[PDB]
Amino acid sequence: AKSAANKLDWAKVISSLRITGSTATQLSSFKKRNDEARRQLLELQSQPTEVDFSHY
Amino acid sequence: VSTLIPPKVVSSKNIGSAPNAKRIANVVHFYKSLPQGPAPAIKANTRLARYKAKYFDGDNASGKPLWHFALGIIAFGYSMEYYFH
Structure with missing residues (x-):
């Protein structure tokens, strides 16, 4: 997941704490x-590429 | 953005702290350390390594050698008294 990347990241921030x-x-x-x-959030903001033409 | 390369570089922590100095001391001292030291003195042999061993070792400091040492000088001049008298 994305959480693997981020968990390793924040763990490493706190490992980076233990190195100056x-x-x-x-x-x-x-x-x-x-x-x-x-x-x-870019991806969640999205307007689907196609125009609405069923209803609109 | 892309992480910097310091965390994966180490090469001066080995002068960077004080126990490095102690380390290079005690790798020499302790590695070539003997389990026990050599001697608390033992030479004076001629049937007098025993005199030193009984009296002038770390085992005891007691007045027995003092008496003995005194008596040697007394024996010299006491005999010489009758050489003078």
């Missing part, structure tokens, strides 16, 4: 989470 000199690796990961969450 990697203070912006997690910020890149956060961005990856953001856009991942963006594409699902």
Whole structure:
């Protein structure tokens, strides 16, 4: 699932907690989470390509 | 966006902390460590390694060698008294 990717991500953010000199690796990961969450809402926002021509 | 490459790079944690210094000490010290040390002194042999062993070992410090050592000097001058008298 998407949850596998995200679980490994947030676990790794908290692993990245346990390592220093990697203070912006997690910020890149956060961005990856953001856009991942963006594409699902992009997809949910969708207007189906076809025009309505049955009713409309 | 694409993760950075630091988490998978390690190469200076081995100077980065204090027990590294201790580690390189105690790999030499302990690796070539003996189970027990060598000696608490033992030489003075001529039937006097026994004198040292009984009196001047770590086993005891007691007044017996003192008495013995005193008596040697007493025996020298006491005999010499009759050499002078």
